[PDB]
Design a protein around this ligand. Structure first.
Ligand code: HEM
Ligand SMILES: Oc1ccc(Cl)cc1Cl
Length: 137
């Protein structure tokens, strides 16, 4: 289930974080508008860029804590407001997060690992509602 998936992802976090982020970046090319440094680079070149690995792992470190602190895939309001008020998130809209989670759920279903794919879909939707309620446009 959802709780076990957090453990599965944490068990190989840097790999999963990179592959999910790449799936997101390649499903939605226009999203590199927020990642100017990742343009014109194949997946293997991205994985050799120090900040690509370091930043993506830190994102997914934090995502797993927001998931872990959730109840029934509903994140805490204190976690949602942290994501909105984050300085690095200044220009983001909730579409950014909705698209991230479509990619992540698509990746899980294609994985052959036994993820609770529907729970992550719910979690992504619930995170998006909590981002709007916390002020994100
Ligand atoms: C649950 C979802 C997310 C979590 C937990 C999260 C968390 C984080 C964290 C921890 C950082 C800092 C990384 C570092 O400084 O090393 C960060 C930076 C950043 N995030 Fe998010 N994030 C999420 C979703 C998104 C989405 C959907 C976007 C855009 C589509 C986004 C755009 C950015 C940008 C532009 C930065 C700063 C630039 C960079 O670090 O390369 N984030 N986020
Ligand atoms: O390095 C990253 C990977 C995924 C997401 Cl959503 C954001 C960042 Cl900064």
């Amino acid at each position: 289930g959802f709780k076990q998936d957090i453990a599965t992802l944490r068990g190989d976090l840097r790999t999963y974080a990179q592959d999910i982020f790449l799936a997101f970046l390649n499903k939605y090319p226009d999203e590199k508008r927020n990642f100017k440094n990742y343009v014109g680079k194949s997946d293997q070149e991205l994985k050799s860029m120090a900040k690509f690995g370091d930043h993506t792992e830190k994102v997914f470190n934090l995502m797993m804590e927001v998931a872990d602190r959730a109840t029934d895939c509903v994140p805490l309001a204190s976690d949602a407001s942290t994501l909105v008020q984050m300085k690095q998130h200044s220009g983001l809209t909730t579409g950014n997060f909705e698209k991230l989670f479509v990619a992540l759920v698509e990746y899980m279903r294609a994985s052959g690992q036994s993820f609770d794919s529907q729970s992550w879909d719910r979690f992504g939707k619930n995170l998006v509602s909590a981002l709007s309620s916390a002020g994100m446009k």
